[PDB]
Amino acid sequence: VDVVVVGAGFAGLTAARAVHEAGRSVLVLEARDRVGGRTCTEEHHGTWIDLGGQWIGPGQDRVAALAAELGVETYPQPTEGDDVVLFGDGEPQRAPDVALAFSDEELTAYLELAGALEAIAEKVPLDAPWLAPEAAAWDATTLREWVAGTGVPDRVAGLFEVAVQAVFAATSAQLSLLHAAHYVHSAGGWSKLTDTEGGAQQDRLVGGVQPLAERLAARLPDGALRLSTPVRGLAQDGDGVTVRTAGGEVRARRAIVAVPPTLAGRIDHDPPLPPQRDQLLQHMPQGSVVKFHVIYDEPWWRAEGLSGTVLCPDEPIGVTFDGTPPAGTPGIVTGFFEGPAAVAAGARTREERRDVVVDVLARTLGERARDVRDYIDRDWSAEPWTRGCYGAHLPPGAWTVYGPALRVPVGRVHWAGTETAERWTGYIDGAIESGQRAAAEVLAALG
Amino acid sequence: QVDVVVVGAGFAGLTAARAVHEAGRSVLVLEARDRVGGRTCTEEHHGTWIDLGGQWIGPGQDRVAALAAELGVETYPQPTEGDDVVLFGDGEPQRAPDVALAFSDEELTAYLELAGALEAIAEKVPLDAPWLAPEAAAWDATTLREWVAGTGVPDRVAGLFEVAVQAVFAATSAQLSLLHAAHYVHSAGGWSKLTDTEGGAQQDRLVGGVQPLAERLAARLPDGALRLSTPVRGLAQDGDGVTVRTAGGEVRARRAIVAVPPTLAGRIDHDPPLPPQRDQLLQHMPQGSVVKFHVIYDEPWWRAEGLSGTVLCPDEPIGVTFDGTPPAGTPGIVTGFFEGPAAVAAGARTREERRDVVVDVLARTLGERARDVRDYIDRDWSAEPWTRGCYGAHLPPGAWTVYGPALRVPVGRVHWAGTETAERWTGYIDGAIESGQRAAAEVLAALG
Ligand SMILES: *Cc1cc2c(cc1C)nc1c(=O)[nH]c(=O)nc-1n2C[C@H](O)[C@H](O)[C@H](O)COP(=O)(O)OP(=O)(O)OC[C@H]1O[C@@H](n2cnc3c(N)ncnc32)[C@H](O)[C@@H]1O
Ligand SMILES: *Cc1cc2c(cc1C)nc1c(=O)[nH]c(=O)nc-1n2C[C@H](O)[C@H](O)[C@H](O)COP(=O)(O)OP(=O)(O)OC[C@H]1O[C@@H](n2cnc3c(N)ncnc32)[C@H](O)[C@@H]1O
Ligand SMILES: [Mg+2]
């Protein structure tokens, strides 16, 4: 074949397609028995359950183009109802929006802390974070260190910490300031990452995200997609690339590897990857998230005038969301254990995580939250073919020293994945970008 | 079929393989390279021994010290005598009988109070469970770099400290959680233990070099125990034991000890897949970045000039140098390293280019005689596919308190060794030895 793509996520599949329609031969070798990767949809209780990525919002041009091209309808994330905020061994507070549980002072400082991180972000080149003028200072500094500088009160530092852990699936301490700043630039600012209406959590897909990936996969000729076919090894010479699977061997001119960084370095590369790139991947840890859907017979919180959104900065769950489909049943409360609370939850059983979620909801939405019909969750850290969501972060010292290896081809081996995107890195939209860019590269470099 | 399969023929893998055989259980050691030693590696050049890998032992290192004397490898002192050369930025190189004496009264105070103030953090950091320090949460949330900045020392002081940090950790004070650095320091017995060249980790060398001593540990295994050029690709456990997949078939065991660097450990195909906290721990244990060099001269000409052969350069690509001349007294060798970002830059250049860079430093520090070079030999340990960086792993902020607890936890019938798992002299040969003895006991107790 002309091109072998490793991975049938949105990055893999988008690269495989652009290569196919250009007039070139391609195989996609995928480890799982399905497509979609970090997107994954299961039917439960008469509706779709997005165990992985579910949300699209404005500014995400490429996924909105894909959904529309392939005949997939969207519905809004519900917005109406009183939100509940809970601090410490305090009582729960009902407001028409989270924001209105904080003082005048507290809100000011919050929006000024966001406005401040955006200032840094705007100066970070999306294609080359290492080339910001303040790159030295910013890559030696954690986000936590920077927040502590702002001299913001504990309750505004707590609120900002819930938003950090909900966006990166890692604490402010794990991230370089330069990584955080690049990610905010990439998304078009803090409100773009955090908001529902006008934000990344604005819209969902009717029937869920995994079907959109399947529709993209059906644009490939029969025999192009190989499922349950993990790539163990990747060899290359001046003539082409030999892909060793278990029970088979594939031979192409060039390769696109579209897996999560930590899985990319697990492949037996021959010759061995250059050291800057091998060490970049040792410095690109995946985040830590357990995503859950609490299932009730009905969205009983709405009848109390409640949105179903709780925000508890001291609880092991950060933010919740009404995940009820457009038909109005079953009622769903969707949420996440993020960073350290996700690692602790992952070490426990399904039933122990259910009891923690239901306890928090009972003390916020109401005691009726213990009357659960079903609980459905996924630890993406446990998934051998992801090993953490939503994607990689870089700790201090990674971006300026190993980061330049991010996108550079090694010979005939090219790189895709949301982690290689300029815009909405970390999101489906970013995956799509990476696919388009990796394919353009291989068409150019081939003929 | 055997009782135990050890992955890695380094000092941790062999030390464990030894204590398993000595207990009367069958063992097979599987090693990806055509040799033993691992991060220790010695070659014959110019009629002497060239340690590309680990080389030094010193006081407190009671394991390696006793393994040496047992298998009969004699030691020789690292030379201490002659002026050291210190050099900051744009300034004039300073000769002093020791590095310290090139600093003001005021500077050396600030430096010593800096090391004291770190050692007092180190003292409350449990060697067995760093995550159980009273203030573990706060210390894990801080870099080494952030904490130094908070002590408020002068720059020369912070840069001299930085030189030392990178000579120990092979990574910047920004890459390291303070908690990780404090544990590393407690594990050694202090900053003097780590940085001194006498009463410290750089006091003594091994006659014939280090790979040999691991060859003498290998030779005390049964015939057929060791398969070199046998990399482990896959490890499958069920109720009755583990199945170790290589390229050339399978090897059934009751229990496995994996004794490879933590980054190499994670790349193995585990079945079932490893528990999340463990897999993600490995994701958070990156190896350091180090290129180690030896500059061959016909004679140690520098002893003529009343010079040690040690240069200390905070602002050059070359960190710390050491007189590497064998006791025979020829050839002259200047031993040194590129550390951290300097290792990664140098790593992407050729051997010839890295040679020019070191000679250019040496000539402006030791003198013009440094150009009359016989030969240059170096090794990029980041570039080795069965190491992927020396000296060992570091942990960034948040790693130790959240993922740390999985570090020694056995996973069904698979157990963990390597210097990264030692409580004492973690990151050294002596800590590999400890991890081997420890891993062995666990597996013997669990067999019977
Ligand atoms: C996990 C997650 C992600 C997510 C999120 C919530 C969770 C819990 N919410 C999101 C959302 O609402 N909106 C959004 O846009 N993104 C959200 N994220 C992240 C998003 O899902 C991802 O950024 C996107 O899916 C990334 O796609 P990409 O194509 O870059 O990566 P992938 O999905 O991991 O695909 C990799 C494929 O590679 C296969 N694999 C792995 N190793 C191998 C080998 N050795 N051989 C062959 N195939 C391999 C995987 O199985 C996978 O299919
Ligand atoms: C690299 C280095 C190390 C070193 C140092 C300078 C350099 C450049 N200076 C030191 C010094 O003066 N004194 C000292 O005590 N240590 C020094 N360091 C550190 C030292 O070398 C290490 O702490 C020590 O070597 C630790 O080794 P350990 O026994 O824990 O294991 P290893 O040496 O890394 O070897 C592991 C072996 O496993 C093999 N391997 C890897 N993957 C596989 C697979 N998949 N299958 C089979 N075998 C595998 C490796 O090839 C290696 O042999
Ligand atoms: Mg709302």
Question: What does this 3D model show about the protein?
Answer:
- 2 copies of one chain form a homodimer.
- The first copy, chain A, is of the alpha/beta class and 447 residues long.
- Among the domains of chain A are: 3-38 and 210-285 and 395-446, FAD/NAD(P)-binding domain; 101-194, Guanine Nucleotide Dissociation Inhibitor, domain 1 (Orthogonal Bundle).
- Chain A has 15 helices and 20 strands.
- Chain A has helices at residues 10-22, 61-69, 104-122, 135-139, 143-149, 154-168, 177-187, 190-194, 210-217, 261-264, 275-282, 339-346, 350-362, 398-401, 428-446, and strands at 3-6, 26-29, 41-44, 47-50, 74-76, 82-85, 93-95, 203-205, 225-226, 231-237, 240-245, 249-252, 254-257, 268-270, 289-296, 306-311, 320-322, 331-338, 374-379, 413-415.
- In chain A, the strands form 6 sheets. Chain A has a 5-stranded parallel sheet, covered by helices on one side. A 4-stranded mixed sheet of chain A has the order 12-11-10-14, with no helix packed on it. A 4-stranded antiparallel sheet of chain A has the order 17-18-15-19.
- In chain A, strand 17 and strand 18 (331-338) form a beta hairpin.
- In chain A, helix 1 (10-22) runs parallel beside helix 15 (428-446), helix 2 packs across helix 15 (428-446) and helix 3 packs across helix 7.
- The radius of gyration of chain A is 22 Å and the shape is globular.
- The A-B interface holds A 139-142, 144-145, 170-171, 173-174, 232, 262, 265-266, 268, 272, 274-276, 278-279, 282-283, 285-286, 288, 339-340, 343, 346-347, 379, 381-382, 384, 387-388, 395-397, 400-402 and B 140-143, 145-146, 171-172, 174-175, 233, 263, 266-267, 269, 273, 275-277, 279-280, 283-284, 286-287, 289, 340-341, 344, 347-348, 380, 382-383, 385, 388-389, 396-398, 401-403.
- Bound molecules: flavin-adenine dinucleotide (2 copies) and magnesium ion.
- Magnesium ion binds at residues 79, 196, 307 of chain A.
- The PDB classes it as flavoprotein.
- Keywords: monoamine oxidase, Thermoanaerobacterales bacterium.
- The assembly is dimeric.
- The entry is titled "Crystal structure of Thermoanaerobacterales bacterium monoamine oxidase in complex with putrescine".
- Chains A, B: Monoamine oxidase.
- Organism of A, B: Thermoanaerobacterales bacterium.
